[PDB]
Subunit: 131 residues, 2 copies
């Protein structure tokens, strides 16, 4: 009980640390879902002056971790599929919404959508979770 | 075609801040083929002394970028799937190999596999590329 509670607190802590390092802020969060935001900076732009896939993945991963933690269900991604629809340019404010779609005994499935300030879809993620 | 692939790779590496920042090195190039290497550092570990997904994704995406641009035609990722198989511990040396599976005039499919120093598969990646305008930057 207190051990489980301690583990949830620890999971939250590590998640907040990654968010801070990435400049991510929680906008909304409840049971099974989290909405976080991040502003693309010149530092995270690739050769094409757009946010590199690695940053986008990190943003999505952070929103997924928050969605797991909202219910004390710490998990790691075992697989993930990503569709890039529009580039994330410098200055853009990206909002990532993660939502649980299925929660089994040991695994689960989470959906994550990233949109820009114009409310247009930047990328769609669907990941399988472990534990 | 290997020499052309290398020329393009050298041109892209010169302006690849993300790759250098991550300590990614290019060790092999050919038409639709790239091998990249990176050492897992403590600066990229999670709460389990294991490498972060974002860093592994970046390594696979780097091999993918170089392989799908080795032909001299600027291309970008429109989609991709990743499977994490084993953790990446500090000090581990990760090698990412990208092979072309298909390459049309516009679209392409490349398979990437990340292996550690013990020859164990860490992750499997598959991405679809889309060419843009002209020559690489």
């Amino acid at each position: 009980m207190s051990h489980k509670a301690w583990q949830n607190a620890h999971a939250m802590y590590e998640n907040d640390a990654c968010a801070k390092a990435l400049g991510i802020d929680i906008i909304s969060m409840d049971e099974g879902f989290a909405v976080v935001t991040m502003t693309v900076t010149a530092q995270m732009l690739n050769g094409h002056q757009s946010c590199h896939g690695g940053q986008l993945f990190s943003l999505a991963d952070t929103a997924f971790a928050y969605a797991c933690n909202s219910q004390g269900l710490a998990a790691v991604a075992s697989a993930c599929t990503i569709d890039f629809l529009r580039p994330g340019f410098a200055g853009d404010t990206l909002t990532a919404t993660a939502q649980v779609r299925h929660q089994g005994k040991q695994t689960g499935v989470y959906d994550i959508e990233i949109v820009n300030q114009q409310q247009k879809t930047v990328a769609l993620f669907r990941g399988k979770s472990h534990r």
